[PDB]
Design a protein around this ligand. Structure first.
Ligand SMILES: [Zn+2]
Length: 257
């Protein structure tokens, strides 16, 4: 099955998921000089005050912090978006080394990791229906660099030992995703895809310009996770990122000058 090894990594995915070679695949390189300011964007609205986290799951390719998405509790609106998008989960992609790990790049620069806050358009009723639509999802992407600790990340880091291996979950209530955001909401946006199989072309990407800083120790804890299940050969969950895909007939827009 697909993964991030030599034998089953991104360069193989097209065999089972031909949309891997599609017209609007993600991630992409963000060429900051060619992105264009778009006056027509609306201000981004990130409304996370009423968020209800539920659980954290090691799904074998990342860990997802899952939310109650049965009401409009944690929603994204504005920016390029029409309508209301509900937070369903967030997860990260990260490297084996601090010099790689992000999926998007900025002028070819790779960050140590990238946070994806995944939201679905409430007009489509559930996530599964939303991923079948061209405007089904909105994913807020945030780069991570290594420097100072991120205090709002620590609660995530410290539960990771309980979900070391694929298929493990743990209760994860009362986590506040506001503690993962940078100061600025300036962003780039473009139409793209899921970055994991099934690679569906259903995402409006909103990638923040300002990275967050995490500590060495925090990223090192990400790197102790396992891709494998308990009782299978240990394979560290590292380098779980898809590289940049061709931009094709897309323009990246900026919210800022
Ligand atoms: Zn992701």
């Amino acid at each position: 099955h697909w993964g991030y090894g030599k034998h089953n990594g991104p360069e193989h995915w097209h065999k089972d998921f031909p949309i891997a070679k599609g017209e609007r695949q993600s991630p992409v390189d963000i060429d900051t000089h060619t992105a264009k300011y778009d006056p027509s964007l609306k201000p981004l609205s990130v409304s996370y005050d009423q968020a209800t986290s539920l659980r954290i799951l090691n799904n074998g390719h990342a860990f997802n912090v899952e939310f109650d998405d049965s009401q409009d509790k944690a929603v994204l609106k504005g920016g390029p978006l029409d309508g209301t998008y509900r937070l369903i989960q967030f997860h990260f992609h990260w490297g084996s080394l601090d010099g790689q790990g992000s999926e998007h790049t900025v002028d070819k620069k790779k960050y140590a990791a990238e946070l994806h806050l995944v939201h679905w358009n409430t007009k489509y009723g559930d996530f599964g229906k939303a991923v079948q639509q061209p405007d089904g999802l909105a994913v807020l992407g945030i780069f991570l660099k290594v420097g100072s600790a991120k205090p709002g990340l620590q609660k995530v880091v410290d539960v990771l030992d309980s979900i070391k291996t694929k298929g493990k979950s743990a209760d994860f209530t009362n986590f506040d995703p506001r503690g993962l955001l940078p100061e600025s909401l300036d962003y780039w946006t473009y139409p793209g895809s899921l970055t994991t199989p099934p690679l569906l072309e259903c995402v409006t990407w909103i990638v923040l310009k300002e990275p967050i800083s995490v500590s060495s120790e925090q990223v090192l804890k990400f790197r102790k996770l396992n891709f494998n299940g308990e009782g299978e050969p240990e394979e560290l969950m590292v380098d779980n990122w898809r590289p940049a895909q061709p931009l094709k007939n897309r323009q990246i827009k900026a919210s800022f000058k």
